[PDB]
Design a binder for this molecule. Sequence first.
Ligand code: A1B59
Ligand code: ZN
Length: 139
Amino acid sequence: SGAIYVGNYRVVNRHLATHNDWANLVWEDSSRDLLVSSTTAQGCDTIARCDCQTGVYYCSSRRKHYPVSFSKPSLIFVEASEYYPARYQSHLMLAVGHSEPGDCGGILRCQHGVVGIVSTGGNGLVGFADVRDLLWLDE
Ligand SMILES: CSc1ccc(C2CC2)cc1CC(=O)N1CCC[C@H](C(N)=O)C1
Ligand SMILES: [Zn+2]
């Protein structure tokens, strides 16, 4: 679990979305595993506008923050699961680091702010759903 709260938006994994999120849908994308919904309260997370390749992510399965070197956003194949069939997930960034299924939603941050959220993982790797390109989150 985990979400990004910027202004009047809530950014979560599309596969972990709730009824409120779908009843107040702004935008959703299965290939990115992102869903953005409406909120009345004014969130304060700063989204990064950058091309950083080093950051810090939160791992709830270890109760720790970890520094990671991560890849550039790309179409990386994700094996079929209970939420999605086998496919390439766009805007995904990989890193060598610990990851477990309940880790989805954990924030990734650099000096510029929020980069993305834990979306995939396994075999000693962790994948992040990038949000730096969603310029409408601030406006
Ligand atoms: C941090 S999630 C994770 C971590 C470790 C593992 C274990 C080492 C295998 C597996 C996973 C699950 C996984 O990657 N997905 C299931 C939920 C939907 C995700 C998607 N965005 O398509 C894909
Ligand atoms: Zn940055």
